[PDB]
Write a protein that binds this ligand. Sequence first.
Ligand code: ADP
Ligand code: MG
Length: 194
Amino acid sequence: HHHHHVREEKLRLRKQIIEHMNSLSKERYTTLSEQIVFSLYEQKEWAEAKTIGITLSMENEVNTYPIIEKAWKEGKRVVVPKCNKETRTMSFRQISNFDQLETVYMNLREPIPALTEEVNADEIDLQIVPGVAYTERGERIGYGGGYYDRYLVHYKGKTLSLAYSFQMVEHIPVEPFDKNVEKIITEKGTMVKN
Ligand SMILES: Nc1ncnc2c1ncn2[C@@H]1O[C@H](COP(=O)(O)OP(=O)(O)O)[C@@H](O)[C@H]1O
Ligand SMILES: [Mg+2]
C-alpha cells in the first residue's frame, strides 16, 4: 500500500497488456476489431450521438479508423484530440476528412489547428475513451499521461471504451484522480455502470 507499490503495479500492468496487444496476430486484430465495432454501432448512445469524440488508433489497439468512416457516413460530427503536453489538456477538434490530420511524431496523428475547429466538451455527445486496461467497474489504466483523467473531470456527456477482452483485469490500483468510464465493449459483450 506504499506509493511505489501503486505506481509500480500500474507500470507492470501497462507493460504486460501492451506486450500482449503487440503480440496479437493480424487475424486476431482484424477479426476482434471488426466484432467490437459491430457491437458499438448497435449501442443506443452511438445511434443517438450527433457528435462523437474519438482517438486515432495505433499499432494493435482496437481499430478506430472504420469508426470515423461510419460516423461520417451517418452524418455524425467527428472530433479528435490535439494534446498539449505542457498543460496536459486536450483540444477536441472536428475532422471531416483524414487530410486534416498531421503526424506530430513517428506514429501519432493529430488535427491540424489551422485546418480544424475546436469543439466544446458540452457539444460532444459521446466520448470513445482509449486505454490500456480496465475492470468490470469501469476503472481504467491509460498510457501514463493522465490526459483523460484530467479531461473527464469537466466532461459530462456519455463515455465508453472499446477493448479486447484480454484488456480486462481483475484489479487496478486506482488513485483519487483516476476517472472511470460508463461502458466497456469487448468482443464478448459489455460491462456497464448501472
Ligand atoms: N485531474 C488531475 N489533475 C492533476 N493531475 C492529474 C489528474 N489526473 C491525473 N493526473 C496525473 O497524471 C499522471 C498520470 O496519471 P496516471 O493515472 O498515472 O496515468 P493514466 O491515467 O494515463 O494511466 C499522474 O502523475 C497524475 O498525478
Ligand atoms: Mg489514470
